[PDB]
Design a protein around this ligand. Structure first.
Ligand SMILES: O=c1occn1/N=C/c1ccc([N+](=O)[O-])o1
Lengths: 121, 108
């Protein structure tokens, strides 16, 4: 099981950005795919989660108008578009699958994708 | 809902140590499905336990989940040198998850 996310991104404030998470080595539709925000000194912070089978979602009230979780079943990938970017959105975003039939536990995480919302000088 | 824990703990090699995960709203129940994750250096995350006490495949059996009083817990019976890492928990509110501050375990 491997969750290979996209490389480091550089994007201006106001613009949008699309991150990825190509899952492999297992049944993509069997597991969920959460998303987390790790900033320095803030620990972890929940964004949401998506069931690939049906594309149903459940967001945090803070990140309801920020993130956009979707999937592509053929490529077994999971995306997350962050819009209206600011200095607060500068964080390493991960993707962590979860078994949910009987019990809800994490297992395999991604390497992370460092996002830097930097203005053009 | 703020998720309180201990800021940091310090166990010796071989000794037992008990982390915790308080909830601000009230006592932690089985409906919260208390999760646990270990962040080793170089940004290496690995989910240990979830749904209170149900372990994931590939996770060492020394890690165990329970409801001690009004909090969830991660008892590391027989701590290793490789266990030296941060430990975030995550309680469920009925519609989303909420992570805590984290607990930096330091094994001597
Ligand atoms: O849609 C739902 O209804 C009841 C649980 N549920 N989804 C669930 C959960 C539960 C826990 C987590 N979790 O740990 O992130 O997602």
């Amino acid at each position: 099981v491997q969750l290979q996310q996209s490389g480091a991104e550089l994007v201006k404030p106001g613009a949008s950005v699309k991150l990825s998470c190509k899952a492999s080595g297992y049944t993509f539709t069997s597991y969920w795919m959460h998303w987390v925000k790790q900033r320095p000194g803030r620990g972890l912070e929940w964004i949401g989660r998506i069931d690939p089978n049906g594309g149903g979602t459940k967001y945090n009230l803070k990140f309801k108008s920020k993130a956009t979780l979707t999937v592509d079943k053929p490529s077994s990938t999971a995306y997350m578009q962050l819009s209206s970017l600011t200095s607060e959105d500068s964080a390493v975003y991960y993707c962590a699958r979860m078994w949910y039939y009987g019990t809800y536990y994490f297992d395999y995480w991604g390497q992370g994708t460092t996002l830097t919302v930097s203005s053009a000088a | 809902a703020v998720v309180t824990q201990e800021s940091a703990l310090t166990t010796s090699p071989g000794e037992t140590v008990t982390l915790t995960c308080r909830s601000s709203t009230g006592a932690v129940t089985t409906s919260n499905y208390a999760n646990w994750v270990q962040e080793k250096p170089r940004h290496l995350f690995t989910g240990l336990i979830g749904g209170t006490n149900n372990r994931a495949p590939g996770v060492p059996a020394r890690f165990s989940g329970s409801l001690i009083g009004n909090k969830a817990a991660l008892t590391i019976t027989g701590a290793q040198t490789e266990d030296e890492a941060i430990y975030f928990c995550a309680l469920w509110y009925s519609n989303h998850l909420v992570f805590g501050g984290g607990t930096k375990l330091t094994v001597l």
